[PDB]
Short mmCIF file of C-alpha atoms in Angstrom, two decimals:
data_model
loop_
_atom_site.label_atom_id
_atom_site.label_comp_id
_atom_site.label_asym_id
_atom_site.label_seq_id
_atom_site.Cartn_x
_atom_site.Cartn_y
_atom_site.Cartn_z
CA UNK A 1 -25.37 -23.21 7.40
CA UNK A 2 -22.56 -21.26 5.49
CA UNK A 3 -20.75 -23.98 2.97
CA UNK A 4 -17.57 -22.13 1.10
CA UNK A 5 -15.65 -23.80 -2.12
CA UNK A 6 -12.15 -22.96 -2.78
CA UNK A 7 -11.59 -22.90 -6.74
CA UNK A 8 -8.05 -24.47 -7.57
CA UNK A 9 -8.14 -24.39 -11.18
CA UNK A 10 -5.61 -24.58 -13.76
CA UNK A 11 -8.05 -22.04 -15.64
CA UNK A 12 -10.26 -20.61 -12.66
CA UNK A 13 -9.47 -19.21 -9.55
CA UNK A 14 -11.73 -18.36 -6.71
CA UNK A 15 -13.80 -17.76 -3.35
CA UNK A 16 -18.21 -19.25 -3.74
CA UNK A 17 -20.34 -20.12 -1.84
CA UNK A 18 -23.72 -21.61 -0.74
CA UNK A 19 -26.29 -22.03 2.03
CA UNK A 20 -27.45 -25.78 2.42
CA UNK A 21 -28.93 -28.07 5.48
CA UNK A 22 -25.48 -30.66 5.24
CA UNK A 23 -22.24 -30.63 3.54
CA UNK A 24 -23.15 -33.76 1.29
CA UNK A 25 -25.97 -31.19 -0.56
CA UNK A 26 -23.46 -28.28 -0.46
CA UNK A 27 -21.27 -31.13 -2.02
CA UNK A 28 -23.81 -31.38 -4.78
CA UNK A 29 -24.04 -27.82 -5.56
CA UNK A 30 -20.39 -26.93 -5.31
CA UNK A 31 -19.42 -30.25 -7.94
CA UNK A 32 -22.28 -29.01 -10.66
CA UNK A 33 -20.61 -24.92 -9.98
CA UNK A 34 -17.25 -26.01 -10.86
CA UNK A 35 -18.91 -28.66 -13.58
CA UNK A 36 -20.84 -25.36 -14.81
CA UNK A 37 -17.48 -23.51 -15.15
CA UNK A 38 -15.51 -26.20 -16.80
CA UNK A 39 -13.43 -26.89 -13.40
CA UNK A 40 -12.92 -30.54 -12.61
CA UNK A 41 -10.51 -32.79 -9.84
CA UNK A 42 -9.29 -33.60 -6.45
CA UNK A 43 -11.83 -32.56 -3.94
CA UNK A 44 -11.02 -32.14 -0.10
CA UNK A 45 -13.80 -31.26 2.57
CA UNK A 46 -12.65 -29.56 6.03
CA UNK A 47 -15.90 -29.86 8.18
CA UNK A 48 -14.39 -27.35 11.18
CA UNK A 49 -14.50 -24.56 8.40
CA UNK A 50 -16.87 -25.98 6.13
CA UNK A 51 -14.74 -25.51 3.35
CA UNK A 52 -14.35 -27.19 0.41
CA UNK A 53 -11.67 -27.53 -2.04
CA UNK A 54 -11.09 -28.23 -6.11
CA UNK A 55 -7.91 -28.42 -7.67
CA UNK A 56 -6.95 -28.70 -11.29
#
């Protein structure tokens, strides 16, 4: 299914996204994206909207 990533950065702001078979993959892909783009902190996860969150 549809996984989405909220960017909360003090430098980078923004709406991704991925397709993967769980959140704890999606997890994976999402924490090497904002890795990728120099983006790293508190992470929340909101299963009902699969959403995940960074913030700076």
């Amino acid at each position: 299914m549809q996984y989405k990533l909220i960017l909360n950065g003090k430098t980078l702001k923004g709406c991704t996204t991925t397709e993967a078979v769980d959140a704890a993959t999606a997890e994976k892909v999402f924490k090497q994206y904002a890795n990728d783009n120099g983006v790293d902190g508190e992470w929340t996860y909101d299963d009902a909207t699969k959403t995940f969150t960074v913030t700076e």
